[PDB]
Design a protein around this nucleic acid. Structure first.
Ligand SMILES: [Mg+2]
Ligand SMILES: [Mg+2]
Ligand SMILES: [Mg+2]
Ligand SMILES: [Mg+2]
Ligand SMILES: [Mg+2]
Ligand SMILES: [Mg+2]
Ligand SMILES: [Mg+2]
Ligand SMILES: [Mg+2]
Ligand SMILES: [Mg+2]
Ligand SMILES: [Mg+2]
Ligand SMILES: [Mg+2]
Ligand SMILES: [Mg+2]
Ligand SMILES: [Mg+2]
Ligand SMILES: [Mg+2]
Ligand SMILES: [Mg+2]
Ligand SMILES: [Mg+2]
Ligand SMILES: [Mg+2]
Ligand SMILES: [Mg+2]
Ligand SMILES: [Mg+2]
Ligand SMILES: [Mg+2]
Ligand SMILES: [Mg+2]
Ligand SMILES: [Mg+2]
Ligand SMILES: [Mg+2]
Ligand SMILES: [Mg+2]
Ligand SMILES: [Mg+2]
Ligand SMILES: [Mg+2]
Ligand SMILES: [Mg+2]
Ligand SMILES: [Mg+2]
Ligand SMILES: [Mg+2]
Ligand SMILES: [Mg+2]
Ligand SMILES: [Mg+2]
Ligand SMILES: [Mg+2]
Ligand SMILES: [Mg+2]
Ligand SMILES: [Mg+2]
Ligand SMILES: [Mg+2]
Ligand SMILES: [Mg+2]
Ligand SMILES: [Mg+2]
Ligand SMILES: [Mg+2]
Ligand SMILES: [Mg+2]
Ligand SMILES: [Mg+2]
Ligand SMILES: [Mg+2]
Ligand SMILES: [Mg+2]
Ligand SMILES: [Mg+2]
Ligand SMILES: [Mg+2]
Ligand SMILES: [Mg+2]
Ligand SMILES: [Mg+2]
Ligand SMILES: [Mg+2]
Ligand SMILES: [Mg+2]
Ligand SMILES: [Mg+2]
Ligand SMILES: [Mg+2]
Ligand SMILES: [Mg+2]
Ligand SMILES: [Mg+2]
Ligand SMILES: [Mg+2]
Ligand SMILES: [Mg+2]
Ligand SMILES: [Mg+2]
Ligand SMILES: [Mg+2]
Ligand SMILES: [Mg+2]
Ligand SMILES: [Mg+2]
Ligand SMILES: [Mg+2]
Ligand SMILES: [Mg+2]
Ligand SMILES: [Mg+2]
Ligand SMILES: [Mg+2]
Ligand SMILES: [Mg+2]
Ligand SMILES: [Mg+2]
Ligand SMILES: [Mg+2]
Ligand SMILES: [Mg+2]
Ligand SMILES: [Mg+2]
Ligand SMILES: [Mg+2]
Ligand SMILES: [Mg+2]
Ligand SMILES: [Mg+2]
Ligand SMILES: [Mg+2]
Ligand SMILES: [Mg+2]
Ligand SMILES: [Mg+2]
Ligand SMILES: [Mg+2]
Ligand SMILES: [Mg+2]
Ligand SMILES: [Mg+2]
Ligand SMILES: [Mg+2]
Ligand SMILES: [Mg+2]
Ligand SMILES: [Mg+2]
Ligand SMILES: [Mg+2]
Ligand SMILES: [Mg+2]
Ligand SMILES: [Mg+2]
Ligand SMILES: [Mg+2]
Ligand SMILES: [Mg+2]
Ligand SMILES: [Mg+2]
Ligand SMILES: [Mg+2]
Ligand SMILES: [Mg+2]
Ligand SMILES: [Mg+2]
Ligand SMILES: [Mg+2]
Ligand SMILES: [Mg+2]
Ligand SMILES: [Mg+2]
Ligand SMILES: [Mg+2]
Ligand SMILES: [Mg+2]
Ligand SMILES: [Mg+2]
Ligand SMILES: [Mg+2]
Ligand SMILES: [Mg+2]
Ligand SMILES: [Mg+2]
Ligand SMILES: [Mg+2]
Ligand SMILES: [Mg+2]
Ligand SMILES: [Mg+2]
Ligand SMILES: [Mg+2]
Ligand SMILES: [Mg+2]
Ligand SMILES: [Mg+2]
Ligand SMILES: [Mg+2]
Ligand SMILES: [Mg+2]
Ligand SMILES: [Mg+2]
Ligand SMILES: [Zn+2]
Lengths: 87, 50, 119, 135, 206, 146, 126
RNA sequence: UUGACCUCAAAUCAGGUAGGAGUACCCGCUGAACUUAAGCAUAUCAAUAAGCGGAGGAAAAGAAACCAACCGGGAUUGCCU
RNA sequence: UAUUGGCGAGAGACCGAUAGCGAACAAGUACAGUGAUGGAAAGAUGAAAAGAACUUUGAAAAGAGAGUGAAAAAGUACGUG
RNA sequence: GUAGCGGUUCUGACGUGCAAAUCGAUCGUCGAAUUUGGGUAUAGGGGCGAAAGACUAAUCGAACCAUCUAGUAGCUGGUUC
RNA sequence: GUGCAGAUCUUGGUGGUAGUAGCAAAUAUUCAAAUGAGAACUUUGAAGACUGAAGUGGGGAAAGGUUCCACGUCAACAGCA
RNA sequence: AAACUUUCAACAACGGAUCUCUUGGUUCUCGCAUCGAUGAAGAACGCAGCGAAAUGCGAUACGUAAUGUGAAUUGCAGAAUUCCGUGAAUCAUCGAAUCUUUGAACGCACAUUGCGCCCCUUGGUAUUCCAGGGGGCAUGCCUGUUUGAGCGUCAUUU
């Protein structure tokens, strides 16, 4: 029984949660993320894997700092403060 | 698994929080579009992957 | 009611610090009420103000340092400008406006004259 | 020479591409020289390099670099050019001398195929351009 | 151009009692196993995807273009043609209608409009207005929502306020002589546009 | 795929050619994009006339040498012969070419003459600040036609 | 006809900016014309309605009726007049929603800034 | 014994720079086969896809170790041809 | 000179919810796979909830009256159907 | 000879199943070349194999994933008044 | 992107089959009371059995993640209830 | 003759065709040049008076400071001091901050909320141990400062 009997011992983790994409693709024995490649200094991606590339690019996320850079640019990286008028 | 690591508890602990029905007042906002909580999760129906 | 900034911005260094502990204890009690009451929105406009206070308490020691540093080379990275990581690199006007002496004399010699046509 | 890696010599596909051992590398060893120091000193910028000596196992080069953030370089408006960000790792794009050599970037007829930059001049001449008022 | 194909789906071969268009693989989601790529497949690429390089603009010989505007022009006399073209011009004096060069100087909408009515325009200016209907299409919702009829053309020789004075009375369009356009000279390839030629414009035609 | 009495055609569509199709839809856009950037170069550039002055030149090859043609620069003699120096002539709108040469005299006298005429028909303002508005004739190349 | 190059006649582009208009933009939109008397009283045709203004419904079923704006329900691009309210079947009374453009302003609620605006526009005031 | 020079080290030494992301376009490296040939090995697809290294608002090229062979032209780039 | 990326705009003889981007919706969601990856369905009461007080049968759901509405031949199963 | 491992025969049950390999009886072996947890190693022209082309996640005379790729098809099917 | 009957055509919806196949392994159930609109099936009392310590007992590892416990409760689900 | 089958019709069912919609998609064009060790893109967990989500935000958490606006927010509850005013707002703008755990990721690790070292400061009768607070410790390289090594090697001594 290659089949359901043997499925019944599928009880150990191949991967666990990637500490860098919290994705349960962190191969225990092999110690690297099948998705993003941590600990490698670079990030796994590949031009053939284009939709998956779309799943993760700048923009699928908070964009905590890049959000406002356009604004800041818009205004000439104003360093300073606004004064007043009235009304 | 009866002796967890804190990374699994904390993920469980959040996942329990998500397991409540729509607060019925939200059905009442102007333009309220949500009818039922469409993401509810059940322990013996979908496993959550550690 | 609540706390206000410019009224804070004129308290004493150690007075703000004081009122914070007030708000903090104040808050404390609200949270003991909230568990006995159904709704309790007072608890916002107070945890709001602890912020306000802290904003003022930090802005003041901060521009303290800003000035007692203002003027020299080397002040904390977190007071220098942010701009772009690459703007932070580009040459200053001085550096990017240097001219060769040999190039300078030449510029003084024959510069681009403002000419025009007709007669 | 360069030995196509290629496990056990295997290549899968056509006779022409079966070759493994008489292969050459279009970049000069002098270029591999700059390359590995340019990274070795990532903050410097490679200005140039000159061969100095060789045995039968090693060619030895002396690369020169220009710390583009040292104020004496940043002034001196003769080399400060290097400080622009448009020269980051100019060795890795083949913009040093031997870069402009191995890229065959010289005026002339013996150079048409590779003169404004082989890949660009290619794309060009294989780009099809239709106007609104076709001709 | 990359639509329909955002799949990675493959045939099933014959031998599974099911047809053999490519199919999405991997279960779990209903799209799983569905027709892919095909022109008849809900979701697939379309037969002969349209292309940018379709020929949109057309070349015309210059001298038969000129021919075309020429003939156009002559029809704008010929009160018969101009009658059949729309254009209520029974109540206009003679054809071609020519007005004195003063028209080219009229700064003010309400004025010119009224000067148009003096020289014969009225009933045709009413043609518009009485006709601005919704558009029957979907074009009705593609920046083409209303469909009115086409009013008179007033060919000024030089433009001293007049061109700004009519731009806003519905259906009235204006042109210099040394231009003269065929899309307006005969709208829809129907000859005989009610032109109101100012004097200076008349004499410059020759 | 050989039929009927047709010509043999050579149509090279065998690489992925659709990858590189240039439908100049911006043909008109690019006009304006130029047209403006010219009327703006004329503004910045004072009264100066938007192009340098160019010499005459005889065309090369058996084919074109019957005609004559706007050059690039004024040799070094043709500028000397008109009595100014290179380094200055270029600040006066004149393009000078060091790499040209002068083996023909009736073109030599030409350019020199043409050079003289350019200095007559212009004026140079002074270095100071007076800034006499003088309404830019826009094109040398039209004003001294070839 | 539009003559700038930064106004768009695009039905879609417009509809989208009305409905997703932020509050501070709907206030101006939610404008009402001044009353006939109220207009020569000021030399000004229209005004961004506000809460304590006073209004008369010149359109609608509730034509004729009048009263004071209980609330400008910006969320709702409506306004609610305290006096014009639908009495329900169980005797409760749900306010009806109104549109400033279908009202007319009878007595402004005046402020320092309210006044300012009247003057910004060229208005005289009593 | 004292002082140097050359050469190398070491400091949580004084101040700085590199990494990673994005990659539509740009400079490189490497590098297929399907396909076409009505077979296929050269050829073709293609100096293309995949892989790699490196930049910018463009890059790159650029003031000739060039085109010519004329009555000669005169940095580069792109268009029409 | 280049630009299927970025920031901001004006458009179209374009598609009109089995179409058009895979997504017009809490869509790269839910769900699948150990993994690389794969990846859906799904828009429309009415101008306004005025979303049906009350009456009665019923364990409830509901029904039958009533009621609201321009219309219940629109009853949160809601345009047409 | 139990349990453990095994899986011989009924060519028994089931053969839209309890089940994508199970159930019953009968059987091989049952103190070691025994069974087996966990950890760890070996990767696709590669691995492992007391050797069947077996096994390598229901996949094996060359895994699964994506891409080149709408591969080509002198053959089959359809081709809308 | 212009006409459909076909393409083991896509997607969606729907029939006849048919109130049919079936709901038959693991020895087995019965009497009352209480509750409740409603009780073969719940709760309690009573009886008859079963597993029979190689357990249908008492705990655990991996794995699941709140399934534990109380209170309320039956629209869906527990292939009669 | 029923029933049953069948056909057409009306009403009612199932289904969701059609029509009319469109804060979406598509393609075209114009303008423009700005991520990151001054910690980026991404991730994980949190945060509301009453949220699961989307959105947004970070223990100062649907937000703090500033500025412009000039009264809202709204599903309910709410303060009520906010309405001729340094002032409402789930408003706009944005120049000041806050910014958990991480991530190139930087004291060492990590399937661990695991384990060091230094400075300051506070308590515990403590330079040594324990506990709380603050602040710190990756690598390659460039310029310099210091401290070194080498009969590599120049001179100076007695
Ligand atoms: Mg390894
Ligand atoms: Mg690391
Ligand atoms: Mg981030
Ligand atoms: Mg700034
Ligand atoms: Mg004011
Ligand atoms: Mg355990
Ligand atoms: Mg929704
Ligand atoms: Mg700095
Ligand atoms: Mg920065
Ligand atoms: Mg070539
Ligand atoms: Mg295949
Ligand atoms: Mg069949
Ligand atoms: Mg499609
Ligand atoms: Mg008027
Ligand atoms: Mg009208
Ligand atoms: Mg019509
Ligand atoms: Mg239309
Ligand atoms: Mg129609
Ligand atoms: Mg024949
Ligand atoms: Mg071609
Ligand atoms: Mg490409
Ligand atoms: Mg283009
Ligand atoms: Mg020019
Ligand atoms: Mg020469
Ligand atoms: Mg001056
Ligand atoms: Mg204006
Ligand atoms: Mg106004
Ligand atoms: Mg509102
Ligand atoms: Mg309204
Ligand atoms: Mg240091
Ligand atoms: Mg990089
Ligand atoms: Mg090669
Ligand atoms: Mg190969
Ligand atoms: Mg092909
Ligand atoms: Mg072939
Ligand atoms: Mg063939
Ligand atoms: Mg073959
Ligand atoms: Mg070949
Ligand atoms: Mg090749
Ligand atoms: Mg070749
Ligand atoms: Mg590539
Ligand atoms: Mg940049
Ligand atoms: Mg440019
Ligand atoms: Mg350059
Ligand atoms: Mg030279
Ligand atoms: Mg040339
Ligand atoms: Mg439709
Ligand atoms: Mg769709
Ligand atoms: Mg269609
Ligand atoms: Mg879809
Ligand atoms: Mg919508
Ligand atoms: Mg519907
Ligand atoms: Mg009823
Ligand atoms: Mg009706
Ligand atoms: Mg209806
Ligand atoms: Mg109802
Ligand atoms: Mg509708
Ligand atoms: Mg057994
Ligand atoms: Mg058996
Ligand atoms: Mg059998
Ligand atoms: Mg049977
Ligand atoms: Mg036996
Ligand atoms: Mg082999
Ligand atoms: Mg192979
Ligand atoms: Mg191999
Ligand atoms: Mg065999
Ligand atoms: Mg399988
Ligand atoms: Mg197998
Ligand atoms: Mg293989
Ligand atoms: Mg597998
Ligand atoms: Mg095909
Ligand atoms: Mg044949
Ligand atoms: Mg069709
Ligand atoms: Mg059809
Ligand atoms: Mg059929
Ligand atoms: Mg059909
Ligand atoms: Mg047919
Ligand atoms: Mg179906
Ligand atoms: Mg039945
Ligand atoms: Mg039966
Ligand atoms: Mg059976
Ligand atoms: Mg029973
Ligand atoms: Mg009992
Ligand atoms: Mg017994
Ligand atoms: Mg017994
Ligand atoms: Mg026993
Ligand atoms: Mg237990
Ligand atoms: Mg469990
Ligand atoms: Mg229980
Ligand atoms: Mg029930
Ligand atoms: Mg269940
Ligand atoms: Mg049941
Ligand atoms: Mg019929
Ligand atoms: Mg509508
Ligand atoms: Mg559009
Ligand atoms: Mg990323
Ligand atoms: Mg803090
Ligand atoms: Mg919200
Ligand atoms: Mg203020
Ligand atoms: Mg806001
Ligand atoms: Mg580390
Ligand atoms: Mg830690
Ligand atoms: Mg350890
Ligand atoms: Mg610490
Ligand atoms: Mg040093
Ligand atoms: Mg030293
Ligand atoms: Zn990862």
């Amino acid at each position: 029984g290659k089949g359901t009997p043997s499925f019944g011992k599928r009880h150990n983790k191949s991967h666990t949660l990637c500490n860098r994409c919290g994705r349960r693709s962190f191969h225990v024995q092999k110690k690297t993320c099948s998705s993003c490649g941590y600990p490698a200094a670079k990030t796994r991606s590949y031009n053939w894997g284009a939709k998956a590339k779309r799943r993760h690019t700048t923009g699928t996320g908070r964009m905590r700092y890049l959000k406002h850079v356009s604004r800041r640019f818009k205004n000439g990286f104003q360093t300073g403060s606004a004064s007043k008028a009235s009304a | 698994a009866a002796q967890k690591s804190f990374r699994i508890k904390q993920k469980m602990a959040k996942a329990k929080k998500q397991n409540r029905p729509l607060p019925q007042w939200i059905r009442l906002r102007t333009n309220n579009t949500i009818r039922y909580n469409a993401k509810r999760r059940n322990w013996r129906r979908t496993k959550m992957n550690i | 009611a609540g706390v206000k900034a410019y009224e804070l911005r004129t308290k004493s260094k150690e007075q703000l610090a004081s009122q914070l502990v007030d708000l903090k204890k104040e808050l404390a009690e609200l949270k003991v009420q909230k568990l006995s009451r159904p709704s309790l929105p007072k608890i916002k406009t107070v945890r709001k103000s602890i912020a306000c206070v802290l904003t003022v308490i930090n802005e003041q020691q901060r521009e303290a340092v800003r000035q007692l540093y203002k003027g020299k080379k080397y002040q904390p990275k977190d007071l220098r400008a942010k701009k772009t990581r690459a703007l932070r690199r580009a040459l200053t006007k001085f550096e990017a406006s240097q001219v060769t002496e040999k190039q300078r004399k030449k510029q003084i010699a024959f510069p681009q004259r403002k000419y025009a046509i007709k007669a | 020479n360069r030995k196509r890696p290629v496990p056990k010599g295997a290549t899968y596909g056509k006779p022409t591409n079966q070759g493994v051992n008489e292969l050459k590398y279009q970049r000069s060893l002098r270029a591999t020289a700059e390359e590995r120091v340019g990274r070795r000193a990532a903050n410097l910028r490679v200005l140039n390099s000159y061969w100095v000596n060789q045995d039968s196992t090693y060619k030895y080069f002396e690369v020169i670099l220009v710390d583009p953030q040292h104020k004496a370089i940043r002034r001196d408006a003769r080399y400060n050019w290097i400080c622009d960000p448009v020269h980051k790792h100019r060795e890795a794009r083949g913009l040093t001398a031997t870069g402009k050599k191995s890229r065959g970037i010289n005026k002339g007829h013996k150079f048409n195929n590779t003169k404004a930059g082989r890949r660009k001049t290619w794309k060009r001449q294989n780009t099809l351009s239709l106007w609104r008022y076709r001709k | 151009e990359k639509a329909g194909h955002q799949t990675s789906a493959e045939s099933w071969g014959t031998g599974r009692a099911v047809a053999r268009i490519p199919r999405v693989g991997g279960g779990g989601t209903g799209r799983s196993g569905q027709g892919a790529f095909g022109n008849m497949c809900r979701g697939g690429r379309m037969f002969a995807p349209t292309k940018t390089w379709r020929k949109w603009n057309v070349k015309v010989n210059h001298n038969e273009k000129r021919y075309a505007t020429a003939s156009a022009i002559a029809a704008t006399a010929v009160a018969s043609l101009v009658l059949a073209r729309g254009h209520r011009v029974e109540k206009i004096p003679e054809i071609p209608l020519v007005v004195s060069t003063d028209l080219e100087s009229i700064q003010k909408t309400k004025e010119a409009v009224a000067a148009l009515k003096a020289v014969g325009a009225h009933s045709d200016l009413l043609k518009v207005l009485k006709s601005k209907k919704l558009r029957a299409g979907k074009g009705k919702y593609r920046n083409r929502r209303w469909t009115q009829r086409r009013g008179p053309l007033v060919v000024y020789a030089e433009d001293n306020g007049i061109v700004k004075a009519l731009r806003n009375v519905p259906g009235v369009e204006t042109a210099n002589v040394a231009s003269l356009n065929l899309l307006q000279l005969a709208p829809g390839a129907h000859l005989g546009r009610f032109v109101i030629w100012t004097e200076a414009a008349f004499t410059k035609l020759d | 795929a050989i039929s009927k009495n047709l010509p043999i055609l050579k149509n090279h569509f065998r690489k992925h050619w659709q990858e590189r199709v240039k439908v100049h839809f911006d043909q008109a856009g690019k006009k304006v994009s130029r047209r403006n950037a010219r009327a703006t170069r004329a503004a910045k550039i004072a009264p100066r006339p938007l192009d340098l002055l160019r010499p005459v030149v005889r065309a090369p090859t058996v084919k074109y040498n019957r005609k004559v043609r706007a050059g690039r620069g004024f040799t070094l003699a043709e500028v000397k012969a008109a009595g100014l120096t290179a380094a200055y002539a270029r600040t006066i709108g004149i393009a000078v070419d060091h790499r040209r040469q002068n083996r023909n005299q009736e073109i030599f006298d030409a350019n020199v003459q043409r050079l003289k005429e350019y200095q007559s028909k212009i004026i140079v303002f002074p270095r100071n600040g007076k800034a006499p508005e003088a309404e830019q004739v826009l094109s040398a190349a039209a004003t001294f036609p070839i | 006809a539009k003559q700038s190059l930064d106004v768009s006649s695009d039905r879609r582009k417009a509809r989208k900016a009305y409905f997703t208009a932020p509050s501070s933009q709907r206030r101006v939109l939610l404008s009402a014309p001044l009353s006939k008397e109220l207009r020569a009283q000021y030399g000004i045709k229209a005004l961004p309605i506000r809460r304590d203004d006073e209004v008369l419904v010149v359109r609608g079923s509730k034509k004729g009726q009048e009263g004071k704006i209980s609330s400008v329900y910006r969320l709702k691009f409506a306004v609610q007049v305290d006096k014009v309210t639908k009495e329900k079947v169980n005797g409760a009374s749900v306010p009806i929603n109104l549109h400033p453009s279908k009202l007319v302003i009878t007595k402004l609620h005046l402020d320092k800034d309210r006044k300012a605006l009247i003057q910004r526009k060229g208005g005289k005031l009593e």
